[PDB]
């Protein structure tokens, strides 16, 4: 599905409304960037060399 529902205590939603009203953005992107700021660094790095193939296919050139 697309859109999320989650439990927010009244005080929290009030805080969100305050922030959004002050910074001049949507509640939704206040919430969103809050999330990004908490989980920002934790993006997994890429991982190569999962196998060694038995044939050389990657180049035409």
């Amino acid at each position: 599905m697309d859109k999320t529902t989650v439990y927010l205590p009244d005080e929290l939603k009030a805080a969100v409304k305050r922030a959004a009203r002050q910074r001049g953005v949507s509640e939704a992107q206040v919430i969103r960037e809050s999330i990004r700021a908490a989980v920002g660094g934790a993006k997994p790095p890429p991982r190569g060399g999962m196998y060694a193939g038995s044939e050389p296919i990657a180049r035409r050139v």
Partner: protein
Amino acid sequence: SHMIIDTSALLAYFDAAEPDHAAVSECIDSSADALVVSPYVVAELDYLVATRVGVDAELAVLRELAGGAWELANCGAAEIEQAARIVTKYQDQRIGIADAANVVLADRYRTRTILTLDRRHFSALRPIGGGRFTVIP
């Protein structure tokens, strides 16, 4: 800020035994760039790995792609329409949707950086915004 990644490069990256593995790995590992992959590239890669190596390799590849390290691009109506136009401009070559879409996406993420091993094929292509593509390995 962004890097558009072709099938060949990914093949070399996931395969430790491919001769270009090291180069591509140095490009990918140690990049600040978001790593952009079209679903067309995902299709190509999936088919090639499944058929020429095996299903376990295919699975490893799909799980890593789904791991969160990668930016998996949408290609919707607008992308396909524009990409068709690009297939047409390049009648010289015969490119098709993977390559054409890579051009489109290069413009969408506003980057000229293309990760591919098809050098001669892709240097003839020009970015939409003008200039030339910067082809790393």
